[PDB]
Design a protein around this nucleic acid. Structure first.
Lengths: 206, 98, 127, 109, 150
RNA sequence: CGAAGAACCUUACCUGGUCUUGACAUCCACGGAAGUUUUCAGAGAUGAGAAUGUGCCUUCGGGAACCGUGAGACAGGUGCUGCAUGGCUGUCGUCAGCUCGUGUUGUGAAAUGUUGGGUUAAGUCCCGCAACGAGCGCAACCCUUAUCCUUUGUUGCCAGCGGUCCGGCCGGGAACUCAAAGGAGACUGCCAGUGAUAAACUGGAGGAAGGUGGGGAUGACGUCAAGUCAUCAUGGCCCUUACGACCAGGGCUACACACGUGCUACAAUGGCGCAUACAAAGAGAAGCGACCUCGCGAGAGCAAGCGGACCUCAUAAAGUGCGUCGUAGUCCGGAUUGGAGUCUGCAACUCGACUCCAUGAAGUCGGAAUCGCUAGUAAUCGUGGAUCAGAAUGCCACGGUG
């Protein structure tokens, strides 16, 4: 290890918090807790929903929760299916009137999360890492953007000797706070080991 | 006595923004009765995750509006005129009403 | 009338008010000799004063409260020297020559993880 | 170039313009007289065949004919159109050089 | 290493105001308890009255005269072995150095108390006594006394 | 050093007693409310009995949470491999380095670029040059500290005016300190000299602040089969009426030596009495604890305030004034031990923190050799916090003097 989180390092500027709200030592303890339960669950029943981030606003006993996804319709439900379920599931989980507003992801090829959850899913589909890692991710360069650094952990392909891979385009100056980058992880528990992946998309400068 | 209010979206800012007053706005001139937390205004929301159908979806969000009072209990001039010298904070509503 | 001069150094807060006449000096309801007098070397406060013939010149009403002796004494010196400059904005060169017009930016230091005192690194006789 | 062209030159700190203007010095010099070439030429006429060594080299590698005015210490084996003349002489250069553009000028009638 | 700036301008004595006496109190100072240093030397410095009876001011400098060297050694990793090539000493350290010998040797005097154990040493300085004065020749016996290398 | 905190617990270790679908998960069979008070046998783990107990889905089969016990698939492993691994970390090193595309060069490994001349903290920059460009780096974005401005004025402030149960205590006042959100400012920008009339250097002006302002944060390509299967996760291998699991007590604080990192000394730049001035950053509902009362004291009783610029832990030490003791092992330095006591907690023998009284050692500055430190630095002086019922000279952090 020898790298600072390209996201948290910027959590101050050019990067909003995926959970903005106030709280005091009292409830704060169980507060961030519920947020985890709800957030962890919203993925379980919406994995293939192609969900990106998941913000969580909190005014007063009424969390908002915004499920950003490239596939909104599927996260919507049969004109009330999905929404109702989730919006209701947030019952005792937070013991408060929790809403839920979906956000459409523009260009699902420039968002880290997706580009990460995807490549990993392809790997689980018995596919050559190099191919997808390169091409199936190279797209982020065709819909725009200036630079995208990918990274696949070890154990790739039949081999006991874990190895990391490079492959990067444009420029990803993660040494610039005013740079703003879309970083996110993604695992892939396969027949053996847990081939990981890290997406570094440089979406413009300042 | 001039009363001051600070309502941010978290302590990450509402903290420094308030300590500033007690430190700067409160030296010897201003009296300052004390920094209070006050009840937080919790406003959560439920949004249907899936686009159309799947009522059983829904996602819950929320925006905690953290507030603070404090307020100076001494209308002087030498110290009650050293607060305007503070207008930073990219998000700390400061309703300086009397 | 009067001429104010902030002045400060090392977490200190000086407040000297120079009046025309009355070489009397008071710092927080105390004498420059009863608060500082007979200390390490609190002869710095009245240094800039005499530096240009004082006592039977003007007055010094200070109100400092920050930092220990050395510093609290350094702040005043800064405020005063700064103050006189008001009564006469054509004596800066003189005061600057000595080095009073400037403040002692040289503040304390912050401790650091791994170390034991911001700089004093832990020993390891065996390496 | 266009930067100074319009008001787009008064952009950024006065210092910046300077740091950017230097590029022109180099650029407009090392290329300023070739910018108008939207594709490899059809014939290359080089003065001394020695100094502009590399120049001629690339040429005979692309199929671009070369008309060079070699010299005694020159290596004419790289020139497909040798002109055994004083590679120097302030007058030699001018006369022939200008004489070249002469035929070229009305070359296209 | 390669750094090249200036000297640290020291604050003059708490009274006579003199850099020469300034760094003097510092070299004598201990545990940052500068206060004691003053109240320990500033006294013995004036206690000379009982030891003489006049404007005790130059006595200090005159006393250091018998403790001011002008030649020191300096081993050099050359010629396979280690040279010694002795060289004089600029004024900047002459006055300084001496002050050390005057104090760093006035402590082992073992008299009534550091306040006085120091005073006497000054009188012994100009009158040649104690290791303070010793160190001089005991050092000179190398430089100027072994110019064979100098 | 994992340990930001070993009396039980923790715990993983030892001894002994004891339990084998099992302390921890599900599935099944049949039963039984869960629950509370309970008696005895035992160190306890537990077992053998007395009650008290019946909530609801009621389609009166069945049930759900939970409990009993029977069988088994299993459950369980801080067990072995860190040369099976993921994740995470230290290190060369904040070092200036590490590469790629294309082009060109050699039969080729490979080179060139990236070398050379100046230059910078730097593969920073400027020329050059068979290379022209590009990426990871370095720089800059982030924080923080150094000036001023806009704004708001409680618990913060008090310049003026006024009233003083003299304390900004009370009107009052938004000036000032301060608080804290947002802004201006530093760029070799300007002056001069050097340099090829370039990069840059050297001084200089102006400023509160120069030549990446000070300090953080940020750690390239990879190396050490470096570290961690013991936080966690996990391939393989192992154990399973037991390297699983429960209790009690003991151990991790043992010694007959050594090595590293620390604290306090060896003293009058000091101790000791009295007196007394100055700061910062911080914690706090099984909490921090006032005032007051008792006690020599640790602390106890009673009981307010603050869940916080309002109150509390907290009423800094060095320091300065006076006086003393006068270079002896002392008026130094405190180890040790005895006497008796407090507070935590079932409980402090083993093995705790502290108080009082008495005891008052070694040590008179330390060979060979060795470490840190370039400025608010080293040096020294206190203050707070994580862990935590209660064992800090350790770690993290703050400010004084310098």
């Amino acid at each position: 290890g020898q790298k600072v989180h390209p996201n948290g390092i910027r959590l101050g500027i050019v990067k909003p918090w995926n959970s903005t709200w106030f709280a005091n030592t009292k409830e704060f303890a169980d507060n961030l807790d519920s947020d985890f339960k709800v957030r962890q669950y919203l993925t379980k029943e919406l994995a293939k929903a192609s969900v990106s981030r998941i913000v969580i606003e909190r005014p007063a006993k009424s969390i908002r929760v915004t499920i950003h996804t490239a596939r909104p319709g599927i996260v919507i439900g049969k004109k009330g299916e999905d929404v109702e379920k989730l919006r209701k599931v947030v019952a005792d989980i937070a013991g408060v009137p929790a809403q839920i507003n979906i956000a459409e992801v523009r260009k699902p090829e420039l968002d880290a999360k997706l580009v990460a959850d995807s490549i990993t899913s392809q790997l689980e589909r018995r596919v050559m890492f190099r191919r997808a890692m390169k091409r199936a991710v190279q797209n982020a360069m065709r819909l725009g953007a200036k630079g995208i650094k990918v990274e696949v952990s070890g154990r790739l392909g039949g081999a006991e000797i874990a190895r990391t891979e490079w492959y990067r385009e444009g420029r990803v100056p993660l040494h610039t706070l005013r740079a703003d980058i879309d970083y996110n992880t993604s695992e892939a528990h396969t027949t053996y080991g847990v081939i990981g992946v890290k997406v570094w998309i440089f979406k413009g400068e300042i | 006595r001039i009363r001051i209010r600070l309502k941010a979206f978290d302590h990450r800012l509402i903290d420094q923004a308030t300590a500033e007053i007690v430190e700067t706005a409160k030296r010897t001139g201003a009296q300052v009765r004390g920094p209070i937390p006050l009840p937080t205004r919790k406003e959560r929301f439920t949004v249907l995750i899936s686009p159309h159908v799947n009522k059983d979806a829904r996602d819950q969000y929320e925006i905690r509006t953290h507030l603070r009072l404090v307020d100076i209990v001494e209308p002087t001039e030498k110290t009650v005129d050293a607060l305007m010298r503070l207008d930073l904070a990219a998000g700390v509503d400061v309703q300086i009403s009397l | 009338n009067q001429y104010y001069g902030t002045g400060r150094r090392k977490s200190s807060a000086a407040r000297v008010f120079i009046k025309p006449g009355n070489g009397k000096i008071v710092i927080n309801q105390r004498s420059l000799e009863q608060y500082f007098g007979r200390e390490t070397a609190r002869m710095v406060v009245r240094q800039p004063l005499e530096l240009v013939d004082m006592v039977e010149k003007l007055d010094l009403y200070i109100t400092v409260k920050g930092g220990g002796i050395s510093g609290q004494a350094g702040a005043i010196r800064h405020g005063i020297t700064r103050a006189l400059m008001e009564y006469d904005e054509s004596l800066r060169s003189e005061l600057r020559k000595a080095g009073f017009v400037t403040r002692d930016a040289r503040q304390v230091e912050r401790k650091k993880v791994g170390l034991r005192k911001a700089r004093r690194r832990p020993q390891f006789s065996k390496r | 170039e266009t930067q100074s062209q319009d008001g787009t030159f008064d952009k950024l700190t006065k210092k910046e313009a300077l740091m950017r203007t230097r590029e022109l010095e180099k650029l407009e010099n090392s290329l300023g007289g070739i910018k108008d070439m939207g594709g490899l030429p059809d014939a290359l006429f080089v003065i001394d065949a020695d100094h502009e060594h590399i120049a001629i080299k690339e040429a005979n590698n692309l199929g671009i004919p070369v008309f060079a005015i070699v010299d005694t210490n020159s290596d004419p084996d790289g020139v497909d159109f040798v002109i055994p003349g004083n590679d120097d002489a302030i007058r030699a250069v001018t006369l022939y050089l200008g004489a070249v553009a002469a035929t070229v000028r009305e070359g296209r009638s | 290493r390669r750094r090249v700036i200036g000297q640290r301008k020291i604050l003059p004595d708490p009274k006579f105001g003199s850099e020469l006496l300034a760094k003097f109190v510092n070299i004598l100072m201990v545990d940052g308890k500068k206060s004691t240093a003053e109240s320990i030397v500033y006294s013995a410095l004036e206690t000379l009255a009982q030891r003489s009876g006049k404007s005790e001011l130059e006595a200090f400098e005159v006393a250091l005269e018998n403790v001011r060297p002008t030649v020191e050694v300096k081993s050099r990793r050359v010629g396979g072995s280690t040279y010694q090539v002795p060289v004089e000493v600029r004024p900047v350290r002459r006055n300084a150095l001496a002050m050390r010998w005057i104090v760093e040797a006035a402590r082992k005097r073992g008299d009534k108390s550091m306040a006085l154990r120091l005073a006497n040493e000054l009188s012994d300085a100009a009158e040649n006594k104690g290791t303070a004065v010793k160190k001089r020749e005991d050092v000179h016996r190398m430089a100027e006394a072994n110019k064979a290398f100098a």
